[PDB]
Amino acid sequence: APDTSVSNKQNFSTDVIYQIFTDRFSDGNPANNPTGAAFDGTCTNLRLYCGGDWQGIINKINDGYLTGMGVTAIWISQPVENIYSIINYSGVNNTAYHGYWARDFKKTNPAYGTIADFQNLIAAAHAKNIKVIIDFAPNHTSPASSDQPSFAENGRLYDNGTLLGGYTNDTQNLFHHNGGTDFSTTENGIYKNLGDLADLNHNNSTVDVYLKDAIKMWLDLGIDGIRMDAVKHMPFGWQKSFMAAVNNYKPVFTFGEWFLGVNEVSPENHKFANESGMSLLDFRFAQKVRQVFRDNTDNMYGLKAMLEGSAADYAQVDDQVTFIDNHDMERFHASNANRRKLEQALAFTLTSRGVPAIYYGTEQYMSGGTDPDNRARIPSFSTSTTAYQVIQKLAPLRKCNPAIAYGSTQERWINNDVLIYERKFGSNVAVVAVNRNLNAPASISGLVTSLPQGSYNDVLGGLLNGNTLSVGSGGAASNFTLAAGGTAVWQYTAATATPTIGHVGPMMAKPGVTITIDGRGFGSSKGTVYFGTTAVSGADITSWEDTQIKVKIPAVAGGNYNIKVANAAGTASNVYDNFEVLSGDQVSVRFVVNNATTALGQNVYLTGSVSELGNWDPAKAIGPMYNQVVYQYPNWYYDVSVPAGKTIEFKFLKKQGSTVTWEGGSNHTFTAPSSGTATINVNWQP
């Protein structure tokens, strides 16, 4: 099938996501609605259930609402069984309508539906070419109080109705018993509770295995992607081990939530996105779009910087999920603000790099502050708004114009208020002009593009006051005026004659797994795929088309590789880098080193005998290690993903800048478990 097909669970770049809060979309089946003091059919009390379900979702899909808009994927609330307790948070009653308070991951939330409802959901969606994504939140169970076992459901965890354990008297130690985090350090928000939420302990085998098994069920249910909650609050290594489990079974596009504040830029965030096996919600894009188009606290120059920098910081920028708002911020649209801002920001996001996500009700200009305020019931299914039409006109271009889905980004004109960018992929080009100034037009002269000579109509049809464009020879545009609040899109498409790789997924897996290579100009006859210098052809290439290739990863040694393709005639493609070949199935192991005392600005790292550990390369060492919560300095710890059942040799080191100090003696040695987790404790050899 082509790259754009609904069946492509590895690439969401040509798609447009619609983020839905199940409870607040549509109640197609009142019968499953909760009753009593947990329900509010008026949905005036934003903390109880309003009754939205899967059925309601099916209904909107079938009656043309989402399809009419151009949406091609839907992202919904965590489907698992939540707690039933109404929780009084100082006079206010709170229900689990949000689905973030899990009690059993192998069961559904009856307020949303039955498994059969779920299966119908996927069916209906699929039938209409819409992919399905679900939230997944393995960091915790529910709000619990260690000495007030009667409070809520005491963070109890079940396994398909079977009681695993509770927060009080946690002998098995399923949970963390370290107190609450003050979000002070990365280490602090990982090993402590998020408020009163029962913190799961990924280091306990039971927990480890339970979670890995739970996600398979859903995978077996046919989901197209997973949205991970609180990735920044769980151990990185465990998460990488989780990714491996998914990818080594049934790979699906996975993205996590790692909140970034205004003007915040984190290297940890980059690294996670680059090596964990999942991509992230592009908080950096979001924050910056808001400042520029909404709060007006930065200008075009700032957008431009975020664009060029992110491109450099993320190994796979096109896998970052963009948006303008979501359930964790106030609605972009403000009561009394000019709608044109929300419109401009939608246009922008839609034609920009990444995977655009639209928060339900945006197209309806919903207003609302922070939680619970940004979680109201969509008040209407009108296709008549300007926003609905914007999406409707742009969304489809992600499928038909590869420049938009996979192209580079390039600034071609700019000032404080204006920004003209060019996207390019093969013989495809898209040019976008935005004039944030709602009061002043701009004189546009000196514009050069890669567009062929000719005239171009605004793809928006003038909806946002766009205009036509006249490109002369040399792609130089003739002078024009860009109306105040003006937005225009122009484009050029044509066949690509040379193999050009636009995307790869999954990006990390063991040999034998089939990966997906999307692009253009691959031709129709099988060619060759290169993993590094190793060539793959024939049978192992399970399928080959012009825009997509499916191939089994050869049994090469664990590591990082570049991928490349060559057509049947031997013409080679561009290189796609950063593919990680695992050394085998993975397990999560806690490494602990005793008495490794450092000096300031000097940390301990870990390295060893396998690719998962850097292969003795200090530039690729794991770390820096943690040292405050679980184990206190001078003891250091760290949760690492390693090849299951393999015998491994390792050593700790002290780095400072790029200046290294090795532990003395001989490598330590250990054999990873076949499954479950383990804890290796040793002392620093001087």
Ligand SMILES: OC[C@H]1O[C@H](O[C@H]2[C@H](O)[C@@H](O)[C@@H](O)O[C@@H]2CO)[C@H](O)[C@@H](O)[C@@H]1O
């Ligand atoms: O002529 C190519 C030139 O076009 C754009 O420069 C603009 C500039 O952004 C505007 O602020 C204004 O000064 O007009 C210039 C065109 O004369 C690209 O930004 C620039 O890099 C490029 O060289």
Ligand SMILES: OC[C@H]1O[C@H](O[C@H]2[C@H](O)[C@@H](O)[C@@H](O)O[C@@H]2CO)[C@H](O)[C@@H](O)[C@@H]1O
């Ligand atoms: O908190 C992590 C911190 O640990 C290391 O610093 C040690 C320092 O070397 C010791 O002499 C002692 O004063 O305790 C510090 C930890 O609290 C790393 O040197 C440092 O970079 C790192 O942030």
Ligand SMILES: OC[C@H]1O[C@H](O[C@H]2[C@H](O)[C@@H](O)[C@@H](O)O[C@@H]2CO)[C@H](O)[C@@H](O)[C@@H]1O
């Ligand atoms: O370079 C591969 C080599 O790396 C490690 O050797 C360290 C050694 O442990 C240190 O004491 C120090 O002398 O630097 C060596 C790196 O050149 C592993 O110990 C070793 O097995 C491996 O071959």
Ligand SMILES: [Ca+2]
């Ligand atoms: Ca219902």
Ligand SMILES: [Ca+2]
């Ligand atoms: Ca945690």
